[PDB]
């Protein structure tokens, strides 16, 4: 591999050296340890928790404006897509963070009006209505 001290760096190799996990299952159980204050070393519950954390539509949602901003931030040309995080999205996020670390790029502006959005009455009413529908569906399923 290639290493430097000005334009490149061993950011990930050193992390691997400090990384205690060895395989996918160890990483999954470590994530489960971190999430749950209780630490039962199970097999399927950790995988289900990790899947529902970011890859479940019913529990995670990047809105259309969220997807558009995500695509524009990482220079990806296509604006539409899905509301679910992919592995490519995380890879691009870490790659861009490394590029910023390497001196190639700059940080965003917190108070820029291109980073702040307006939420009106209709959107909030829709959110509350969806919350009510979510509350109804559980009892519906139970009695069904």
């Amino acid at each position: 591999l290639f290493t430097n001290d000005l334009d490149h760096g061993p950011y990930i190799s050193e992390t691997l050296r400090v990384d205690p996990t060895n395989d996918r299952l160890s990483a999954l159980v470590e994530i489960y340890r971190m999430m749950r204050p209780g630490e039962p070393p199970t097999r399927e519950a950790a995988e289900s928790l990790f899947e529902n954390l970011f890859f479940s539509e019913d529990r995670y949602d990047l809105s259309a404006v969220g997807r558009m901003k995500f695509n524009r931030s990482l220079l990806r040309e296509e604006i539409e897509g899905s509301g679910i995080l992919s592995k490519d999205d995380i890879i691009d996020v870490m790659k861009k963070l490394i590029d910023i670390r390497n001196g190639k790029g700059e940080v965003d502006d917190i108070d820029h009006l291109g980073n702040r959005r307006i939420r009106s009455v209709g959107e909030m009413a829709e959110n509350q209505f969806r919350v009510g529908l979510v509350r109804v569906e559980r009892a519906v399923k139970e009695r069904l």
Partner: protein, 45 residues
């Protein structure tokens, strides 16, 4: 000149040509609520 304005015309000291009229001042709330309640075939809102 309209009927209401013709009874009392206010002398204007402005010197630059008006190009874009002042929009309806309550557009935001009504547009939001209409987007909330209007039928949507695409189902976006």
């Amino acid at each position: 000149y309209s009927y209401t304005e013709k009874k009392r015309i206010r002398k204007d000291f402005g010197k630059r040509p008006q190009v874009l009229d002042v929009p309806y001042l309550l557009s935001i709330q009504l547009d939001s609520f209409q987007k909330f309640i209007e039928q949507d075939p695409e189902g976006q809102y």
